[PDB]
Amino acid sequence: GANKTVVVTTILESPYVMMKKNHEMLEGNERYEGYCVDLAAEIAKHCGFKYKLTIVGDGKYGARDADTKIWNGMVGELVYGKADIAIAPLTITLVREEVIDFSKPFMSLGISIMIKKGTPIESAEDLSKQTEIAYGTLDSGSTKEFFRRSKIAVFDKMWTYMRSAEPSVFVRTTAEGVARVRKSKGKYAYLLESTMNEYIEQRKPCDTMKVGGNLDSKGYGIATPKGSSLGNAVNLAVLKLSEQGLLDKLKNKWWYDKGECG
Amino acid sequence: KTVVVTTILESPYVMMKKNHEMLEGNERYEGYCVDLAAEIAKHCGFKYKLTIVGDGKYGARDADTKIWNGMVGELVYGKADIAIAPLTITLVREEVIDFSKPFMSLGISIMIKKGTPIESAEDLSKQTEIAYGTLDSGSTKEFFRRSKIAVFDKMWTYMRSAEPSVFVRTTAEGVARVRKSKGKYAYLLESTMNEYIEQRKPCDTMKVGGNLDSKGYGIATPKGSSLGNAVNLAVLKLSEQGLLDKLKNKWWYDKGECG
Ligand SMILES: CN1CNS(=O)(=O)c2ccc(CCc3ccc4c(c3)N(C)CNS4(=O)=O)cc21
Ligand SMILES: N[C@@H](CCC(=O)O)C(=O)O
Ligand SMILES: N[C@@H](CCC(=O)O)C(=O)O
Ligand SMILES: [Cl-]
Ligand SMILES: [Cl-]
Ligand SMILES: [Cl-]
Ligand SMILES: [Cl-]
Numbered sequence: 137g138a139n140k141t142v143v144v145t146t147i148l149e150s151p152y153v154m155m156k157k158n159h160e161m162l163e164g165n166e167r168y169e170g171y172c173v174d175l176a177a178e179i180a181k182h183c184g185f186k187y188k189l190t191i192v193g194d195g196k197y198g199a200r201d202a203d204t205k206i207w208n209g210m211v212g213e214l215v216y217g218k219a220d221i222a223i224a225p226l227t228i229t230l231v232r233e234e235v236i237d238f239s240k241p242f243m244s245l246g247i248s249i250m251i252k253k254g255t256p257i258e259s260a261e262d263l264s265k266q267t268e269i270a271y272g273t274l275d276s277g278s279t280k281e282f283f284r285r286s287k288i289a290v291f292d293k294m295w296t297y298m299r300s301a302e303p304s305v306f307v308r309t310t311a312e313g314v315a316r317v318r319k320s321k322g323k324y325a326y327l328l329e330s331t332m333n334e335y336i337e338q339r340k341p342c343d344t345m346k347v348g349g350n351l352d353s354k355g356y357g358i359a360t361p362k363g364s365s366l367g368n369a370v371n372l373a374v375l376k377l378s379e380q381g382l383l384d385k386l387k388n389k390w391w392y393d394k395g396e397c398g
Numbered sequence: 399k400t401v402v403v404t405t406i407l408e409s410p411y412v413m414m415k416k417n418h419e420m421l422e423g424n425e426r427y428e429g430y431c432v433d434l435a436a437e438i439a440k441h442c443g444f445k446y447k448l449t450i451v452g453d454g455k456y457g458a459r460d461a462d463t464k465i466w467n468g469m470v471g472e473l474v475y476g477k478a479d480i481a482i483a484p485l486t487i488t489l490v491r492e493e494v495i496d497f498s499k500p501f502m503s504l505g506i507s508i509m510i511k512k513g514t515p516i517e518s519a520e521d522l523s524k525q526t527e528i529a530y531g532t533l534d535s536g537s538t539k540e541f542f543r544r545s546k547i548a549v550f551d552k553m554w555t556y557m558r559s560a561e562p563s564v565f566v567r568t569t570a571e572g573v574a575r576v577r578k579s580k581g582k583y584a585y586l587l588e589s590t591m592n593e594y595i596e597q598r599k600p601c602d603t604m605k606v607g608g609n610l611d612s613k614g615y616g617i618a619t620p621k622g623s624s625l626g627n628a629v630n631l632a633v634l635k636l637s638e639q640g641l642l643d644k645l646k647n648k649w650w651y652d653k654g655e656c657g
Contacts, residue, residue, distance in 0.1 A: 228499060230634040240487060244503060244612060288640055353503060353643070355614075375489040378613070381547055 142180070142187040142366070145210045145219035146172055147195065149310060151335055151390040152225050165189045171390040175242065176223045178382065179358065182373040183366065190219065195309065196276040197226060209276055211236060214361045221366060222359040225331065227278035229354075237364060238357035239371040242383055246350025247279055248330040250314070252343060255322040259348040263325060264293045271325040272298055272305025274313060279327055280306065282352060291351070317344055331356075338395035401439070401446040401625070404469045404478035405431055406456065408569060410594055410649040411484050412448075424448045430649040434501065435482045437641065438617065441632040442625065449478065454568065455535040456485060468535055470495060473620045480625060481618040484590065486537035488613075496623060497616035498630040501642055505609025506538050507589040509573070511602060514581040518607040522584060523552045530584040531557050531564025533572060538586055539565065541611065550610070576603055586610075597654035 146153050152172040159167045165176075168189055180187050198211025206212070210226060213219040214236045227245070228238045251257050255269065263271050271294070273279045283295040298305050305324075307313040313326040314336055333346045358374060360367045377383050405412050411431040418426045424435075427448055439446045457470025465471065469485060472478040473495045486504070487497045510516050514528060522530050530553070532538045542554040557564050564583075566572040572585040573595055592605045617633060619626045636642050 228634070230631060230638055233499075233631060233634055238499070240492075240497070241500065241614070282638070285638065286640070352637075352640075354637070355500070372489060372492060375487070375492055379489055379541070379544070379611075381545075381611075384612070 142185045142221060143219045144176055144187050144189050145192050145213040145222045146189055146224040147192050147210060149225060171386050172223050174386055178377055179370055179373050182376060183369040199276040214359055225356045226359055227354050228357045229278050237360045237362055237367045239374045241355025241357050242374050243331060243356045245329040245331045245354055246352050247282060247327060248333045248350050249347050250317055250326040250328055250333050250344050251347055252317050252322045253345050255325065257325055257347060260294065260351055261290050264290045269323055269325055270301060270305050271327060272307065273327045274310060275306050275308055279329065335391055338397050340396045342397035401444045401480060402478045403435055403446050403448050404451050404472040404481045405448055405483040406451050406469060408484060410653060430645050431482050433645055437636055438629055438632045441635060442628040458535040473618055484615045485618050486613055487616045488537050496619045496621055496626045498633045500614025500616050501633050502590065502615045504588040504590045504614065505612050506541060506586060507592045507609050508606050509576055509585040509587055509592050509603050510606055511576050511581045512604050514584060516584055516606060519610055520549050523549050528582055528584055529560060529564050530586060531566065532586045533569060534565045534567055594650055597656050599655045601656035
């Protein structure tokens with residue numbers, strides 16, 4: 137049939153998607169800026185489709201409710217046919233690949249530790265062997281699922297603590313985790329993806345630090361519903377952009393060219 | 399039916415065992431990709447036969463005949479059912495074969511003999527005393543041939559016409575050239591292999607500078623293969639169980655010989 141506008145689900149997560157200065161004077165895709173906004177435009181141009189960016193209603197990446205088995209977040213938008221494609225920092229995972237399709241990765245990441253500068257923590261093993269400093273993860277994402285499912289001794293011990301900690305150590309948004317690090321005087325550490333950690337480290341007031349090596353090695357992919365006709369073209373577009381160096385330029389544009397800490 | 403796996407002799411991915419001459423079949427070989435093959439086959443439930451690619455090449459398309467060689471060619475023309483090897487995901491290959499999600503990350507990197515006054519690709523491009531080249535018939539050479547980045551295009555212009563040839567047929571030949579050229583040759587190769595060799599005797603090479611790109615290895619199948627889906631889910635399963643990280647530590651850090 138005739139060409140229709142592709143519905144893109146994404147999420148407000150800096151620097152992937154951010155509200156522009158004066159967004160209240162703008163409409164449609166012009167309201168937004170960031171790495172994934174630029175990436176959407178490049179993918180759409182190579183694949184030759186028009187699109188509308190839509191922020192996921194519940195603000196979640198995507199997890200499956202154990203009881204109802206209903207998917208939420210951006211994953212749910214694809215599963216239930218409310219969006220045609222997700223262009224966001226959406227981590228490739230086994231459970232998600234069982235229900236949606238992912239392109240080859242457009243960016244690498246691993247789980248990492250964010251501390252307030254001066255916190256006497258250097259590693260996940262350090263976190264697991266003490267109780268003075270609390271720590272947690274984002275809700276409804278791949279990081280929380282990583283710890284829930286891990287059989288590695290240190291990570292299993294961390295999950296056993298996190299799942300029962302009171303008050304809750306989990307946060308609903310990355311911004312809430314950053315605020316908790318900054319306001320807890322070194323008594324909270326935040327487990328998040330190295331990409332977001334490195335971005336925040338270069339934003340004012342320059343009071344956080346990434347410590348230790350990454351806990352795993354993964355990537356973000358552009359997601360489509362299973363059997364989608366867009367998957368093949370999107371996949372080739374990602375690989376083309378990668379080999380031309382454009383994904384590297386976009387990373388430098390939105391992370392380091394924008395750095396505020398020197 | 400028994401799955402024919404094409405792979406390539408490349409340390410520490412696939413290596414001949416000690417006393418291999420008295421062994422038979424898959425037992426002749428050891429390494430990261432040998433272990434990975436066993437894990438994939440177990441999760442997907444197939445029997446397999448490891449076969450070293452006849453021409454010893456990863457895979458490139460002949461510009462004139464448009465015939466693919468190497469492991470890529472084995473898949474395209476039906477001589478193998480799957481490739482389990484350090485085979486780089488690239489656009490040109492994705493147009494003719496299928497790749498799993500990546501099982502290992504890498505980037506192009508620089509290998510020097512210790513003490514060579516080179517710190518970056520920009521350093522190499524701005525001088526002529528130190529020659530440099532890449533492996534033939536692989537993704538690294540193709541990267542430089544197709545690049546429009548100023549530094550890498552300048553490097554390609556030099557490499558393509560240098561005499562004697564700066565390209566080598568095997569990784570081992572590139573390393574030997576670094577070690578024997580008294581600092582007058584630097585070798586462009588993937589960071590995974592660079593880091594492995596750096597920790598092998600005689601401990602006389604060094605990786606310098608950041609990686610020039612960011613990519614990964616994938617398990618490859620012919621287009622439309624019924625094995626593609628299961629293999630992909632198996633890789634992701636192994637990744638999340640931490641088994642790919644275990645395998646890396648087994649074949650890289652456990653084999654380090656330089657302290
Ligand atoms: C950025 N980029 C460009 N496109 S690409 O050539 O396909 C490509 C392949 C691999 C990586 C390395 C990072 C990564 C991403 C994704 C996964 C990983 C590891 N591992 C190691 C486990 N499997 S995965 O799919 O979660 C990056 C990459
Ligand atoms: N990238 C993650 C969200 C962030 C996190 O879980 O740390 C996901 O796709 O679920
Ligand atoms: N991994 C490369 C071979 C090594 C190289 O080109 O440096 C390939 O798949 O072609
Ligand atoms: Cl429309
Ligand atoms: Cl058979
Ligand atoms: Cl022997
Ligand atoms: Cl040949």
